[PDB]
A and B are shown apart, each in its own frame.
Chain A
Amino acid sequence: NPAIKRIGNHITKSPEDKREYRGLELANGIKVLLISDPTTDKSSAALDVHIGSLSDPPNIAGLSHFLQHMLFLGTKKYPKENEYSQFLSEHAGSSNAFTSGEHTNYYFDVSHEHLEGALDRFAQFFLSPLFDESAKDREVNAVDSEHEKNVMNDAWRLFQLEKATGNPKHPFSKFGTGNKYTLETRPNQEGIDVRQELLKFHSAYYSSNLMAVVVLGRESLDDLTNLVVKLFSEVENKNVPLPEFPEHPFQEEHLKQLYKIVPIKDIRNLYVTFPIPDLQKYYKSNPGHYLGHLIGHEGPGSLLSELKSKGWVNTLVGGQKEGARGFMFFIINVDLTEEGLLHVEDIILHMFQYIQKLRAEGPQEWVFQELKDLNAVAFRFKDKERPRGYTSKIAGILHYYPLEEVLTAEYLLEEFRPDLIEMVLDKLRPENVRVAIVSKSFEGKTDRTEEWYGTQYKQEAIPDEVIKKWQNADLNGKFKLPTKNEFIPTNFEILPLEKEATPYPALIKDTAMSKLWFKQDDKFFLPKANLNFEFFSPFAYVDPLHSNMAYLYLELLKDSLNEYAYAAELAGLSYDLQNTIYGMYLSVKGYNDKQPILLKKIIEKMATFEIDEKRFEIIKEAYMRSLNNFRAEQPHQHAMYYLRLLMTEVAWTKDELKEALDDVTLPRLKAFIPQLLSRLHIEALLHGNITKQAALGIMQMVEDTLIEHAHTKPLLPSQLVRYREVQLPDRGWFVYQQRNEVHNNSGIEIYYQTDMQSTSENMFLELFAQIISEPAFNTLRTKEQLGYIVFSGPRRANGIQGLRFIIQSEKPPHYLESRVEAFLITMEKSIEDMTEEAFQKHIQALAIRRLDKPKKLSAESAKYWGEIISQQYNFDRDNTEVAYLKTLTKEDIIKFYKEMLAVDAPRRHKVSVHVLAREMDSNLSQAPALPQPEVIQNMTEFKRGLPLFPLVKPHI
């Protein structure tokens, strides 16, 4: 075959991986990975072009990103604007893309039966995109709106500010996102034809020698091979040289600098950065990984430990950060407590002391060896990935590794290279440092403004005395290298499947104190388990005060176990512990082999917990900030929040929590934990490589520990109170209106409540949702350009359900609302006119979506945990509900629309949350006339004036 330059050899895979692989290089220079998995419910492809923002023209910031939007909008094999995404939608698929500095990465998934159709529509993006003129004018708004969303986000502000304080002549300085000004307004003024410029960029850079493709389906390797060759050898090779950037964006003048910056949220952070050469080529020994592992360690003797003990910082991130071909960074980043902000010079001193300890001891092979072994285990035992993410990640790394080495390259670690370690470490020095501090205390004391985000800041040289006192960092006896990691798993046996192993979880214990659900894993056979526990207590959430105390206590506990648990996390054993509205959640995941040791430690600490005064004050203060900081979350996130507050029986607001928090004292917290712990019920799912007897053993010990140390006794059945959804009146329409004080965009969520969940009411709603899904995005966003964020779909809470739209926009919510209603009418007309073939396509897509099998253990646990915490316990739900779906008719869906959702439906139940932009006042399809809504004035008054739904009835 003359279409294929080369077929690759064996692709090194994990032993536990049952998928089959073949790499190849097409004659046009495209790198390919084909993945055959004959069990997959969804097939997938991705293509990654090794070009991005770093190559935008200097006078059209954002071109490559914009180009990336435009490729979705028609090709002239498939000129119909939304052909691609309508096809995926009717065949259970989904798609997305991103632009980074050097890559533009596109990907989809689709039902395994429609790979070729999906793939051929996709391949056209790369042959002849339309860039239609009127679609260009529309979609620049989506881009602009995407920038708008980020403008007031602290992380983007910082990301761009770093760019703006390095070499302005360096392409690292470029603004990558684009916006209406850079894409349309400034180019019109300059006489630039943006259409030509998209085409020119695509023609110059979308070349086959810069592309990798990955394709995953049911087909054999040979068939997938034919498929790829068919669709992609047509791609032109323009022989583009790969952009390289050997000059570091930070030169001499950009070093030994201090930046003091004003954030939007009340946060205090120190960012420390050193410029470093590109380390990518050393991937085999990865000295950057090695140094990050040490500098960023969190266990005893670590730099964090000390800083945290001094009461300076709570969290720390260390290690190498990507730049581009030719440069990288090494960062050490911390949060600051109020003392920490006064002690920045000391924090940095300590950073250098720790570094100097590494210098003094030299590189440690035993450490490198432990990283190597741990990576080897993680790779032997890796979870099977979802196809979409997997094709995308892999398409990205085919640019970096020989075909044969791509599955292994980002895991396996090979030769210890003490010498490269010293070369990197030797770049980590005071003469080489950039310091940034972020804090509201610089408000009014800054003299510079970043040009794209408007970020307020100041820049100063670090004085020579400071650099010198840092260069003299002596050693500090509080810094030691990590001890050997004792959590490393060593028992990997898959216990054989028991005589009466069940396919769904079985209830193997049911006492007053515990309900215990158990299933031995019958699909994955990895030495791993998931242990999930819900602990109910009425005192977790009885009142704002208490709800604050539940939270604080769990934080303080995590803070206290952190040194010990970090090791465990490195060894693939982790946990999650948080307060809920019912009392506490605890989850331990990872290799089964040492789970009981960590589990036991957690329950032991939790029941015998002694609070550190200094810790308590620090964490309380961070939580206070965390509560105020909600004001700077996105308008659409505000709308979802207020709706949850409105529709739930009991819910404390951030204002209520914040008010009640000054009253939380050390002595009341100390009294709170015993009370919290004294009476409990525990519901549990243990799922994994574990046996009935071991499960009982695990549960017994959780109990015996609580019982022993906390004297815990069971709860009454009637004390086990789940909460209700507000029941909306037939034909009611309510609006709650609030303002976001930070973002100059508005948000809205509209909720059409339907009825209690049940087989039929579930599938009516889900099918309608399916039918309107891409039309909603296509109309409200693509056609009308209301905003970058446009979502629609089912809302499920507290046993009830309904259909929701969320949108964020520069347009006022009253307007968004008429548009949604207009769209609903367009949707109705569209269902009346659609063919039976089309309708069954939708049933079929929904069906595939719901039956798609879990690919890893924890996705299967999440399904069961869903059924448990919601107390519906319907483990065979997908089968029942899909059989039922298959029965539904167009006429049915219409009658349901007509009784529940249409504007003059007898049972319409509508609530809208309107969140006004910072700055706003207190052709198209025909919008219908709407009633005067009842304006909600007070959430409590609203909840009280209304009935409450029942709770849903359970199954097993």
Chain B
Amino acid sequence: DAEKLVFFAE
């Protein structure tokens, strides 16, 4: 098929 975030909580 057709075709990276650090968060505060998961």
Q: Write the residues of chain A forming the contact surface with B, with a CB cutoff of 8 angstroms.
A: 53, 65, 68-69, 72, 96-100, 146, 155-156, 159, 176-177, 289, 292-293, 296, 298, 316-321, 331, 566, 777, 788-789
The reply to whether B3 and A96 contact each other, CB–CB distance below 8 Å, is: no
Report B1-10 residues with CB < 8 Å from chain A CB.
1-10
Determine if B2 and A318 form an interchain contact, defined as CB atoms under 8 angstroms apart: yes
Find out whether the CB atom of A96 lies under 8 angstroms from the CB atom of B7.
yes
Which A-B residue pairs are the 7 nearest by beta carbons? A319-B3, A292-B2, A98-B5, A319-B2, A97-B8, A296-B2, A296-B1
Smallest CB separation, B3 vs chain A (Å) = 4
Query: Which has the most chain A C-beta neighbours within 10 Å: B2, B6, B9, B10?
Result: B6
B3 touches A321 (CB 8 A): yes
Is the beta-carbon distance between A97 and B7 smaller than 8 angstroms?
A: yes
* Bound CA–CA A805/B2 (angstroms): 39
Which of B1, B6, B9, B10 contacts A176 (CB under 8 A)? B6
> Are A318 and B3 within 8 A (Cβ)?
yes
B2 to chain A: which residues have CB within 8 Å?
289, 292-293, 296, 318-319
Complex CA gap A625/B1 in Å reads: 23
Q: Knowing A788-B10, A789-B10 touch, does A100 contact B3 (C-beta < 8 A)?
A: no
Most buried by A among B7, B8, B10: B8
Bound-complex Cα distance A331 to B2 (A): 10
Chain B residues with CB under 8 Å of A331's CB are: 3
Residues of B near A72 (CB, < 8 A) are 8
Please report the C-alpha to C-alpha distance between residue A754 and residue B1 in the assembled complex, in whole angstroms: 46
Partner among A53, A98, A317 whose Cβ is within 8 Å of the Cβ of B3: A317
Chain B hits for A566, CB < 8 A: 1
Do A100 and B5 touch (CB < 8 A)? yes
> A68 — nearest CB in chain B belongs to which residue?
B8
Distance in angstroms between the alpha carbons of A777 and B5 in the assembled complex: 22
Q: Which residue of A lies closest to B8 (CB)?
A: A97
Which residues of B are found within 8 Å of A292, using beta-carbon distances?
A: 2-3
Residues of A within 8 A of B3 (CB): 292, 296, 317-321, 331
In Å, the complex CA distance between A789 and B7 comes to 11
Q: Which residues on the A side are within 8 Å of B7 (C-beta)?
A: 96-98
Least CB separation from A158: chain B residue: B4
Q: Which residue of B lies closest to A321 (CB)?
A: B3
**Chain A residues within 8 Å of B8, by CB:** 68-69, 72, 96-98
Contact, CB under 8 Å: A317 / B10: no
Enumerate chain B residues within 8 angstroms of A320, measured Cβ to Cβ.
Answer: 3
CB of B10 to closest CB in A, whole Å: 6
Are B6 and A317 in contact, CB atoms less than 8 angstroms apart? no
Q: Which residues of B contact A65 (CB under 8 A)?
A: 6
Evaluate whether A177 and B9 lie within 8 angstroms (CB atoms) in the complex, with A296-B1, A298-B1, A317-B1 already known: no
Q: How far is the CB of A516 from chain B (nearest CB, A)?
A: 34
Is A146 touching B6 in the complex (CB atoms < 8 A)? yes
Residue contacts A-B, CB under 8 angstroms, 22 given = A53-B6, A69-B8, A72-B8, A96-B7, A96-B8, A97-B7, A97-B8, A98-B6, A98-B7, A99-B5, A100-B4, A146-B6, A176-B6, A292-B3, A293-B2, A296-B2, A298-B1, A317-B1, A318-B3, A319-B2, A321-B3, A566-B1
Question: Within the assembled complex, what's the spacing in Å between the Cα atoms of A777 and B8?
Answer: 12
Q: Which residue of A lies closest to B9 (CB)?
A: A96
| A72 to B5 alpha-carbon distance, docked (Å) | 18
* Chain A residue nearest in CB terms to B7: A98
Bound-state CA distance A520–B3 (Å) is: 35
Complex Cα–Cα for A319 and B1 (A): 8
Closest to A65 in B: B6
Contacts of A97 in B (CB 8 A): 7-8
Name which residue of chain A comes closest to B10, CB basis. Answer: A789
Closest A residue to B4 using CB positions: A159
What are the residues of chain A within 8 A of B4 when measuring CB–CB?
A: 100, 155-156, 159
